[PDB]
Amino acid sequence: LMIVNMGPHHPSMHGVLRLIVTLDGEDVVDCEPILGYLHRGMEKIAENRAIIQYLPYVTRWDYLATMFTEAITVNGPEQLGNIQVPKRASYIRVIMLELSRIASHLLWLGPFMADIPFFYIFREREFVYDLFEAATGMRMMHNFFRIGGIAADLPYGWIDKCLDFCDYFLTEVVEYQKLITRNPIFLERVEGVGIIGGEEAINWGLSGPMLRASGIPWDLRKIDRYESYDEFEWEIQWQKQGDSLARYLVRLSEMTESIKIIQQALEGLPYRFISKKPSPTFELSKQELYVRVEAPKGELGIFLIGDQSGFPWRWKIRPPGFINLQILPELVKRMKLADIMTILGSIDIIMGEVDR
Amino acid sequence: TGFMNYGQQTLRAARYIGQGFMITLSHTNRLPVTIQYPYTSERFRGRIHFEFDKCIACEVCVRVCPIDLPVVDWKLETNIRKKRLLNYSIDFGICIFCGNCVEYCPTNCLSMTEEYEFSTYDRHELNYNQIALGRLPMSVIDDYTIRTIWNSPQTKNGVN
Amino acid sequence: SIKFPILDRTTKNSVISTTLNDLSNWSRLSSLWPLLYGTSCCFIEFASLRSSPRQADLILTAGTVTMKMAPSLVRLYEQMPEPKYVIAMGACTITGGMFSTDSYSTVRGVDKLIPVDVYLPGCPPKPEAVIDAITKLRKKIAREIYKDRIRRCFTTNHKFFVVRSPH
Amino acid sequence: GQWLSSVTRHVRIYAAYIDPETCESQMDKLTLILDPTEEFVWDDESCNKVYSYFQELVDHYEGAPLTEYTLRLIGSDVEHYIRKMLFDGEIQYNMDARVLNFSMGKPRVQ
Amino acid sequence: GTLSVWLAKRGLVHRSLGFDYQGIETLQIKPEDWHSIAVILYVYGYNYLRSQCAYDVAPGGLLASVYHLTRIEYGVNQAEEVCIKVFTHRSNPRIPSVFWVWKSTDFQERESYDMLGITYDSHPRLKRILMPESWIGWPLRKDYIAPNFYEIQDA
Amino acid sequence: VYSMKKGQIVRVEKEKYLNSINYLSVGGLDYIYEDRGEVLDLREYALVGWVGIPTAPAWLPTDMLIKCEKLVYER
Amino acid sequence: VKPDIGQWLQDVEEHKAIAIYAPHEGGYEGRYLNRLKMQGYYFLDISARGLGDPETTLLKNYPVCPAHLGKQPIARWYYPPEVDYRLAALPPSAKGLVVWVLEAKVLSKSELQFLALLPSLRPNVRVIAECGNWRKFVWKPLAEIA
Numbered sequence A: 001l002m003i004v005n006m007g008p009h010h011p012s013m014h015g016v017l018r019l020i021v022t023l024d025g026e027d028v029v030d031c032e033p034i035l036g037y038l039h040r041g042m043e044k045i046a047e048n049r050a051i052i053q054y055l056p057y058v059t060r061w062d063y064l065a066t067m068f069t070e071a072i073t074v075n076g077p078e079q080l081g082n083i084q085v086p087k088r089a090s091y092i093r094v095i096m097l098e099l100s101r102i103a104s105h106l107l108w109l110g111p112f113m114a115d116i117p118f119f120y121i122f123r124e125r126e127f128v129y130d131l132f133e134a135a136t137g138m139r140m141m142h143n144f145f146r147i148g149g150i151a152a153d154l155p156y157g158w159i160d161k162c163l164d165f166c167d168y169f170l171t172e173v174v175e176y177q178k179l180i181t182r183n184p185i186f187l188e189r190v191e192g193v194g195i196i197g198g199e200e201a202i203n204w205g206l207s208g209p210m211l212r213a214s215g216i217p218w219d220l221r222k223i224d225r226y227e228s229y230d231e232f233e234w235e236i237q238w239q240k241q242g243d244s245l246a247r248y249l250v251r252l253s254e255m256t257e258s259i260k261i262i263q264q265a266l267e268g269l270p271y272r273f274i275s276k277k278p279s280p281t282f283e284l285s286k287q288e289l290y291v292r293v294e295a296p297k298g299e300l301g302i303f304l305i306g307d308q309s310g311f312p313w314r315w316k317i318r319p320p321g322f323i324n325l326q327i328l329p330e331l332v333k334r335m336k337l338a339d340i341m342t343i344l345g346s347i348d349i350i351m352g353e354v355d356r
Numbered sequence B: 001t002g003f004m005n006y007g008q009q010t011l012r013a014a015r016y017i018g019q020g021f022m023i024t025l026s027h028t029n030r031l032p033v034t035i036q037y038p039y040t041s042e043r044f045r046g047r048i049h050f051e052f053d054k055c056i057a058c059e060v061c062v063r064v065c066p067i068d069l070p071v072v073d074w075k076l077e078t079n080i081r082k083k084r085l086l087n088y089s090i091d092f093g094i095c096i097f098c099g100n101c102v103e104y105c106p107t108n109c110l111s112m113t114e115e116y117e118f119s120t121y122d123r124h125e126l127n128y129n130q131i132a133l134g135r136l137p138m139s140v141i142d143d144y145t146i147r148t149i150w151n152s153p154q155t156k157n158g159v160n
Numbered sequence C: 001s002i003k004f005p006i007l008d009r010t011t012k013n014s015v016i017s018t019t020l021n022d023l024s025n026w027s028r029l030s031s032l033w034p035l036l037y038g039t040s041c042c043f044i045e046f047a048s049l050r051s052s053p054r055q056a057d058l059i060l061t062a063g064t065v066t067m068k069m070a071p072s073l074v075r076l077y078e079q080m081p082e083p084k085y086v087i088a089m090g091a092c093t094i095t096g097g098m099f100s101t102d103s104y105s106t107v108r109g110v111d112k113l114i115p116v117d118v119y120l121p122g123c124p125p126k127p128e129a130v131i132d133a134i135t136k137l138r139k140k141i142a143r144e145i146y147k148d149r150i151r152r153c154f155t156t157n158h159k160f161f162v163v164r165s166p167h
Numbered sequence D: 001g002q003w004l005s006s007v008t009r010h011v012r013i014y015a016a017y018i019d020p021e022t023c024e025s026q027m028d029k030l031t032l033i034l035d036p037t038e039e040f041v042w043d044d045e046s047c048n049k050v051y052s053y054f055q056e057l058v059d060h061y062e063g064a065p066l067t068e069y070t071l072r073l074i075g076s077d078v079e080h081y082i083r084k085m086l087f088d089g090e091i092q093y094n095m096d097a098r099v100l101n102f103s104m105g106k107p108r109v110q
Numbered sequence E: 001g002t003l004s005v006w007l008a009k010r011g012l013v014h015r016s017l018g019f020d021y022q023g024i025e026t027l028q029i030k031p032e033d034w035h036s037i038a039v040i041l042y043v044y045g046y047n048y049l050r051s052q053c054a055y056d057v058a059p060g061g062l063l064a065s066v067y068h069l070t071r072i073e074y075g076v077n078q079a080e081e082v083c084i085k086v087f088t089h090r091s092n093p094r095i096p097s098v099f100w101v102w103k104s105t106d107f108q109e110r111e112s113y114d115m116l117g118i119t120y121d122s123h124p125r126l127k128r129i130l131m132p133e134s135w136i137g138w139p140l141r142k143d144y145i146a147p148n149f150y151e152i153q154d155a
Numbered sequence F: 001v002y003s004m005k006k007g008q009i010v011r012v013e014k015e016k017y018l019n020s021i022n023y024l025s026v027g028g029l030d031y032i033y034e035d036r037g038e039v040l041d042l043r044e045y046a047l048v049g050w051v052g053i054p055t056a057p058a059w060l061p062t063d064m065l066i067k068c069e070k071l072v073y074e075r
Numbered sequence G: 001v002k003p004d005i006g007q008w009l010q011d012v013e014e015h016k017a018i019a020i021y022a023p024h025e026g027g028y029e030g031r032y033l034n035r036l037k038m039q040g041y042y043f044l045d046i047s048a049r050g051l052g053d054p055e056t057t058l059l060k061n062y063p064v065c066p067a068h069l070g071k072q073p074i075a076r077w078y079y080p081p082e083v084d085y086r087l088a089a090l091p092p093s094a095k096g097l098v099v100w101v102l103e104a105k106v107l108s109k110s111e112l113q114f115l116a117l118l119p120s121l122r123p124n125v126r127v128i129a130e131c132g133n134w135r136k137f138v139w140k141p142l143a144e145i146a
């Protein structure tokens, strides 16, 4: 039972974490995940900062998809103050949020395919960041979410590049879909892990790909009527093969479902930039409001107890992947050191929203 | 016939290696783009351009900042509402370039540029002055090593 | 208020020795090869630009360093002790970054932890900024003539036992 | 794990079996490594004064459990003592390293 | 609420605090009968617990570790949310953990003990999940001072 | 609408703030016991914070702290 | 490359203000700085990418102004000068001069570069080692445009 140190510079690059295991032989049997490495103290500083000052702070959580964090932390005060967002800016927010979900799943499967290369996905990623530069102007550090919608307007080149992104992107996606059917090393090196079912993934804490891996059509934005999700084409992954390749088909189907949503929303266009802007500064109320949104990892959440002041009295975040990190102590029991790379890939986690 | 099943697994494996080898050989044909060193739009939010006489009052850069870094000393001059502003000290090691007061300025003398070459040898050098923050960075068309960056187009294949 | 160096002479003042020093310094300024050290928001520049933690002396700290990160970081600098230095490529390796006021478990720069040559603007710049940073560092090492191989150990210690109370 | 220290600039706890500069294995022998980066002058008599002051501070500040919080407190006020010693001119700077950042501020004309 | 007058009305203290902002409901529950209350709300239809919230109103006084338990599932989508309000004080940090039945509460209760210091039982490994094990004091409570540590200042 | 003003020195005794953790580090020591903390905001409770130490602020009761004087200290 | 001649040292001891026209092609710039350092001199660094009012920074004890993060006061203290304290940063007597290595030719203002070159003529032990806007070769043109 030689204790692994599981150091800060991992052989893989998926964050800094601590997974000391007794490993009797090569079989890992007992996990003790030590965290606190990439920690900032978001809650106390968010109690010490306003919404327009913790609004630059929402970038250090799920920075592979930064639209979700600022999206839920601006959708908090919109439903809190009951201020209506017009349909145009809300649908463009839906388009860019699904594009960030696309970016999150491809930036998962990039380094996951690198561990188990970079320019096989970067040919797409250069045009993806060109879309981010034509949408807001930054690469992943955007500050463009207001109460009335997008802080700016879409330029006349970004809608043309958004029309071109579908037949720029879906063809290389379906050229990348056949690899797992062709290449048997993904049928023999990541096949098998992920043995949890649906009645158990509901039982512990799970959401996102680990909950849709068992063949459950789970969606917050389908159950909760949000952003007119029943107008668009939906196909939530009811893939019941359980394992890690079931999760890969889950993520391919989620990317293709977002492609279908954006492709139906290419020519929608139902309406200004910011509705209800009389003054630059405002405040918040005091309610008992827990707002959540469909994360790419499953139910990102914002807890809020107001102060009727410039600062929020309570600001607690429920990150999706940190609740999804609880299941590995149970998914460690009968695997190998060559398996834990596939495990910490298939969790689909970065340490930005973990410690926070 | 278990070794026959091993052979059939390796036949499917060789078919997949050949198909993925064709895919990667086609992936090696990414010749026109090739991003590297030189040897964007207006919202780059890089180096922040600052103007001194247009900066007058309200001290909103020290307030909306997530860390409150700006240090400007000021002494009121009588009956003319002049604050006598001096030493617009910005530490870019403290600065995030997250851009709140760039668009939240009442004067709007705070504007962003495309400069990002501020990698320096000392932290005390990063404390910049108001005249150092009023310098036009670069006209990137006018270099003998920088061509036109593919801003509006993509995969041009025109250099060759 | 500073100290005084020795500054006697330059003993290696032949043409062959200064030629070998210039060539070894320019080749030392040519072969960066970092051990990457990402695992933060500055890891994103690695895909656009080893594993033995005693090998690569020319590492740049491209990560958000905290107080719990600090013992492993000074141990890793003990694993790169004599030849080369580190480059701060984050506002949090310089001033603590955006949390420079109120963060308890984050050090206000590694400028109180490790010798730093070059300070960056910090939050992920363009991928040619690291190229300009290693070019500057190459100009810095080109100024260095390997200090004419001039060496001193302090060795401050008490052999009296502390008033200990372990668990 | 095995490293139990609060190591900063000019203050390193290093409670290990370190008589010479060869590290090991770990014990109650706190080996105060000072100035790793060659930042100041650090004359030997002044180093003996600072080491004796640190010995008196760890003698009078013990009695409680010598866990990591006492290590943070003792390294922190040791750095305060080094700062107030260099501000009074007992510790000059170095200008022999490749940085010389003047970590405690430039001495004024006052 | 629904379960406070139907299931917890048969001899349990479901002390309601009204409705919350959107659809949630806050019901005050004491710290002695909490694990049986957790099992009773578990066998009701509610299975999915997330976002244990440890808010620190009235520093030096009342301390709370509320829940956001709901009843989402695979095929059905009856999302009935509720806040199980458990309360404590500074003098009494003793609270029962749900880690005996709901084992996935390791990180949640460890962060609650790590940021407030709420003393727990029936828990397999209650350690400081973000701070060192030598660390005394708790930062999230509003009556806390970060002591004289040089790494907290720039200088 | 509040108890005191904003910007007065805060003196702290170890017995006067016995609800907090002021007796764990018996002896190291601390620094906010003397007239070092300044009142930055008030509500029953008042925000505090040192004039030179840049660390995170806190919240303390209006009787648990004490408005000492107007004497800032730096360098 | 590697043209073996110390004519740049003759330029720095004759004119002492030369624009170092040299690319970003690695460290082919500090070798003459290393030859000045091996001659017994001392060389320190500066950059004009964020240096404003250069004569008011090299002399006249420009202010410190510590950046408080919304907690400390203004504390308008006077930091020591750049090159006067650098002349005060020569403890032995064998140091013949002080080289001021400047590595930013852009955002420099031609007038202020002439003002900084005249400040290299102010002290006799000051050497200006400014950049030359990154030519392809290694060219050491003097301060003629400035």
Ligand code: SF4
Pocket: B054, B055, B056, B057, B058, B059, B060, B061, B062, B105, B106, B107, B108, B109, B110
């Ligand atoms: S620049 Fe902005 S913050 Fe400064 S005085 Fe003018 S309006 Fe106020």
Ligand code: SF4
Pocket: B048, B061, B064, B065, B066, B070, B095, B096, B097, B098, B099, B100, B101, B102
């Ligand atoms: S540039 Fe960004 S960090 Fe700096 S003061 Fe303006 S908003 Fe704050």
Ligand code: SF4
Pocket: C040, C041, C042, C062, C063, C064, C065, C089, C090, C091, C092, C093, C097, C098, C122, C123, C124
């Ligand atoms: S300064 Fe900001 S972006 Fe850079 S490493 Fe630190 S936290 Fe990340």
